[PDB]
Design a binder for this molecule. Structure first.
Ligand SMILES: *[C@@H]1O[C@H](CO)[C@@H](O[C@@H]2O[C@H](CO)[C@@H](O)[C@H](O)[C@H]2NC(C)=O)[C@H](O)[C@H]1NC(C)=O
Ligand SMILES: *[C@@H]1O[C@H](CO)[C@@H](O[C@@H]2O[C@H](CO)[C@@H](O)[C@H](O)[C@H]2NC(C)=O)[C@H](O)[C@H]1NC(C)=O
Ligand SMILES: *[C@@H]1O[C@H](CO)[C@@H](O[C@@H]2O[C@H](CO)[C@@H](O)[C@H](O)[C@H]2NC(C)=O)[C@H](O)[C@H]1NC(C)=O
Ligand SMILES: *[C@@H]1O[C@H](CO)[C@@H](O[C@@H]2O[C@H](CO)[C@@H](O)[C@H](O)[C@H]2NC(C)=O)[C@H](O)[C@H]1NC(C)=O
Ligand SMILES: *[C@@H]1O[C@H](CO)[C@@H](O[C@@H]2O[C@H](CO)[C@@H](O)[C@H](O)[C@H]2NC(C)=O)[C@H](O)[C@H]1NC(C)=O
Ligand SMILES: *[C@@H]1O[C@H](CO)[C@@H](O[C@@H]2O[C@H](CO)[C@@H](O)[C@H](O)[C@H]2NC(C)=O)[C@H](O)[C@H]1NC(C)=O
Ligand SMILES: *[C@@H]1O[C@H](CO)[C@@H](O)[C@H](O)[C@H]1NC(C)=O
Ligand SMILES: *[C@@H]1O[C@H](CO)[C@@H](O)[C@H](O)[C@H]1NC(C)=O
Ligand SMILES: *[C@@H]1O[C@H](CO)[C@@H](O)[C@H](O)[C@H]1NC(C)=O
Ligand SMILES: *[C@@H]1O[C@H](CO)[C@@H](O)[C@H](O)[C@H]1NC(C)=O
Ligand SMILES: *[C@@H]1O[C@H](CO)[C@@H](O)[C@H](O)[C@H]1NC(C)=O
Lengths: 312, 226, 161
């Protein structure tokens, strides 16, 4: 997971919907409204920042040539499908398909297509230039020789690769096929992402549900109190409702802050992986999959990213 | 050349920091946040929270205990809630800062006290070294890195054939400008003559793909006939 | 119908827009509910046709501005609404007023959303545009070509923590 939903809430409208009697009472509580709005704004900005940090790791938008002569290696299942409406790969489509009162939802600064463009750029760089495009200028190199470097990087001589080129390519392609199969049948693979969504959804429903409560007042409806009791009694009941709803908003905001901290941790990890793993070849054990790391390929996903770690 | 480049870069750092302040946003932001969290807090003293006044002595100087108690209960509830909010926000912010600080310590270890092979952990490029500099409530690393600049196209080949056998480079890659073949280190064009001292043998030429033909010079043979 | 009104039905009140619905209430069902125990539809007590209640259009009002040190000229963003309810530009974020729509793409200065950013540029005025991810490039990949550096530079980058 990388990002959350950029939710925002009008505390005033949530507590005192279309009521003046209520709003004048709410003014007595000070800046509570403003600081809640401020916190949520902070969260939304953080989400955008997370996405930027993860994907926008590359200076230029590299693109692959029409020829796919990568020494026998097949990347059609991860490279963009130009026929499709979005510039997204087969696997990216699978991932996108395996995920499902004063409240507003702000849209993200980068759209699925921009994320896909970033991933395509990173992928093309990793393919045509290896790791040189992270250091600086992308320097072309045959894929086989790139893999020879990646072999020398794990204490295996490069003759092994050339002498076993066909086998290596076949193994790689078969593994990619297996990835397709795994993602197609079992959705549970993307739990980490789905979970996130659910949480937020819950946190919203709950919030909304907390409007239907009396909090020790005569009723949940503001208009009923206004129209039935006289002001001196009505004010007390409205105070009860306002206390309850304000407390509910505070709870929601606090939970969202904590959840945002968790997501930011995840996003920082993702950025670190895209740097040490995609843009390079990591010697940190079990940081880039169980095995001797060769390389990694990114794929976007709803509010998150996916690494395919190729290991020896 | 290297020394001059380094010194010029340091000069550029001076200029960048002197011209614009926005560079230190990460620090300033922090300050601002805290300031707000305090101002807000203070502001919440001026509120009534349903009471007849936002002042305590005024209530004490107007009402008897039986009713001053109620008003003071209202004020206390409000102010206690405000304090709880402040403390919670501060705890979360402190967690954030602690994460940042742990990162900074990791950088001072892997980057200053050493030379990291982690990518983009210690600046855009191949990490050479780093130098720390203090700053209010934070630290600033100057990462010195090696960035290849001038690049040239060359024909290449994963190996060559000399006597049916296949020669691979020990440290580097085979290249050709169009006429002659060489072997050179990948990170810098330093072409050398292809020999048995620069290469090692494995198998033959009926396996490798993209293999080519050229002559490998053996330094030993001329020494003998000489 | 089709207007923001303050409605009062048999036992309930609210503010919203009443529209002809496609729902199928039972003969005894009067007012519909959402997932979040929210009233979404009603049955008119006099005429037995069903009406959907849509909340009256609302949303944030944000100001886009360069530094006052530069200019006092600004733009306005009405969030998640339509320009109808209000040099105009409709976006996934809402209605943008005071900023010129431009085909040219630049790097983002002031983010708005859904790939739209804005900035103050040359005579001078505020402009909105789809932001540029970067300069497009193609690498000359061939199975027998390699680029090797003949030179280098020493870069000094500042990281503040
Ligand atoms: C790689 O394997 C894939 C299996 O998906 C094949 O790619 C197909 O290529 C054919 C033409 O060769 C196209 O009609 C299909 O649209 C492609 N399928 C997809 C979904 O990409 C092919 O066997 C290999 N392709 C490459 C580039 O090597
Ligand atoms: C090394 O193990 C691999 C298993 O991955 C073997 O490669 C297989 O070769 C058989 C026939 O020799 C083919 O049917 C398979 O398609 C290959 N496997 C894959 C997944 O491509 C290989 O034979 C083994 N080599 C040694 C030394 O026995
Ligand atoms: C390698 O690149 C560097 C950086 O451009 C070159 O060093 C500069 O050379 C120019 C003119 O030759 C001088 O004006 C600068 O003073 C040098 N840079 C610094 C700050 O030292 C160098 O000439 C290049 N070498 C090659 C092979 O062309
Ligand atoms: C490719 O680089 C080398 C530079 O060393 C050139 O190869 C030389 O060719 C000349 C002319 O026949 C010989 O006398 C030298 O012995 C060769 N040098 C070595 C050490 O191989 C070659 O000319 C260059 N090609 C081009 C197009 O400039
Ligand atoms: C290196 O030279 C050998 C020797 O000529 C080449 O081997 C010939 O390959 C052709 C087709 O490629 C065959 O028709 C001949 O029978 C081969 N000759 C012999 C006697 O082996 C080889 O192609 C060359 N390799 C490269 C890299 O060009
Ligand atoms: C009450 O008077 C209204 C006013 O016309 C009538 O509304 C009808 O409602 C019935 C069912 O509620 C519908 O089948 C008719 O189409 C409505 N007629 C019109 C012209 O609106 C109706 O006479 C009375 N409704 C009831 C409850 O009997
Ligand atoms: C290599 O030649 C290609 C022609 O396709 C060109 O795009 C590239 O800039 C050249 N690289 C260098 C700078 O040697
Ligand atoms: C390199 O590619 C060209 C065209 O794609 C092809 O004719 C040639 O056989 C390839 N060489 C190798 C290394 O197989
Ligand atoms: C306004 O911008 C100018 C141009 O950079 C600068 O010199 C000046 O310090 C700025 N003034 C303020 C109010 O910061
Ligand atoms: C905005 O209004 C126009 C015309 O009033 C209408 O065609 C369009 O469907 C509306 N768009 C949205 C976002 O509802
Ligand atoms: C953008 O291009 C479209 C398509 O031709 C054109 O109708 C429109 O006038 C252009 N807008 C601007 C800002 O030039």
């Amino acid at each position: 997971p990388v990002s959350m939903t950029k939710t925002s809430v009008d505390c005033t409208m949530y507590i005192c919907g279309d009521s003046t009697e209520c709003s004048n009472l709410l003014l007595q509580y000070g800046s509570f409204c403003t600081q809640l709005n401020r916190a949520l704004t902070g969260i939304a900005v953080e989400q955008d920042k997370n996405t930027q940090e993860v994907f926008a790791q590359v200076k230029q938008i590299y693109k692959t040539p029409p020829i796919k002569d990568f020494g026998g290696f097949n990347f059609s299942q991860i490279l963009p499908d130009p026929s499709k409406p979005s510039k997204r790969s087969f696997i990216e489509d699978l991932l996108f398909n395996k995920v499902t009162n004063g409240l507003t939802v702000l849209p993200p600064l980068l759209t699925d297509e921009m994320i896909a463009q970033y991933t395509s750029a990173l992928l093309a760089g990793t393919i045509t230039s290896g790791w040189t495009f992270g250091a600086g200028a992308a320097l072309q190199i045959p894929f086989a020789m790139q893999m020879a470097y990646r072999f020398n990087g794990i204490g295996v001589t490069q003759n092994v690769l050339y002498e076993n080129q066909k086998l290596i390519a076949n193994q790689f392609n078969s593994a990619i096929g297996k990835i397709q199969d795994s993602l197609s049948s079992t959705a549970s693979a993307l739990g980490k992402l789905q979970d996130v969504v659910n949480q937020n959804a819950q946190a919203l429903n709950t919030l909304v549900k907390q409007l239907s409560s009396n909090f020790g007042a005569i009723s949940s409806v503001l208009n009923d109190i206004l129209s039935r009791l006289d002001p001196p009694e009505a004010e007390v009941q409205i105070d009860r409702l306002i206390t309850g709803r304000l407390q509910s908003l505070q709870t929601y905001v606090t939970q969202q802050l904590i959840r945002a901290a968790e997501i930011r941790a995840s996003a920082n990890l993702a950025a670190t992986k895209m740097s040490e793993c995609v843009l390079g070849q990591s010697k940190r054990v079990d940081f880039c999959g169980k095995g001797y790391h060769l390389m990694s390929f990114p794929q976007s996903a709803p509010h998150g990213v996916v690494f395919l770690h190729v290991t020896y | 050349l290297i020394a001059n480049q380094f010194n010029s870069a340091i000069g550029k750092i001076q200029d960048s920091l002197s011209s614009t302040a926005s560079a230190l946003g990460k620090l300033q932001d922090v300050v601002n946040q805290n300031a707000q969290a305090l101002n807000t807090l203070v502001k919440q003293l001026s509120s009534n929270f349903g009471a007849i006044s936002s002042v305590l002595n005024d209530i004490l100087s107007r009402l008897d205990p039986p009713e001053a108690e109620v008003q003071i209960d209202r004020l206390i509830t409000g102010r206690l809630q405000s304090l709880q909010t402040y403390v919670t926000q501060q705890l979360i912010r402190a967690a954030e800062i602690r994460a940042s600080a742990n990162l900074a310590a990791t950088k001072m270890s892997e980057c200053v006290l050493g030379q990291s092979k982690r990518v983009d952990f210690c600046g855009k490029g191949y990490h050479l070294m780093s130098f720390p500099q203090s700053a209010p409530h934070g630290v600033v690393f100057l990462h010195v890195t090696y960035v290849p600049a001038q690049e040239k196209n060359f024909t290449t080949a994963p190996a060559i054939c000399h006597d049916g056998k296949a020669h691979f480079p020990r440290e580097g890659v085979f290249v050709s400008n169009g006429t002659h073949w060489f072997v050179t280190q990948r990170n810098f064009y330093e072409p050398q003559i292809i020999t048995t001292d620069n290469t090692f043998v494995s198998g033959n030429c009926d396996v490798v793909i993209g293999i080519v033909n050229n002559t490998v010079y053996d330094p030993l043979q001329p020494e003998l006939d000489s | 119908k089709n207007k923001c009104v303050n409605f009062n039905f048999n036992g309930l009140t609210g503010t919203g827009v009443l529209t002809e619905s496609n729902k199928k209430f039972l003969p005894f069902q009067q007012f519909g509910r959402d997932i979040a125990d929210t009233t979404d539809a009603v049955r008119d007590p006099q005429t037995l046709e069903i009406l959907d209640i849509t909340p009256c259009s609302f949303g944030g009002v944000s100001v886009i501005t360069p530094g006052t040190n530069t200019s006092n000229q600004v733009a306005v963003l009405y969030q998640d609404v339509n320009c109808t309810e209000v040099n105009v530009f409709q976006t996934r974020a809402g209605c943008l007023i005071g900023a010129e729509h431009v085909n040219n793409s630049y790097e983002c200065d002031i983010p708005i959303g859904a790939g739209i950013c804005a900035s103050y540029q040359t005579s001078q005025s505020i402009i909105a545009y789809t932001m540029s991810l970067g300069a497009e490039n193609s690498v000359a990949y061939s199975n027998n070509s390699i680029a090797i550096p003949t030179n280098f530079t020493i870069s000094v980058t500042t990281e503040i923590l």
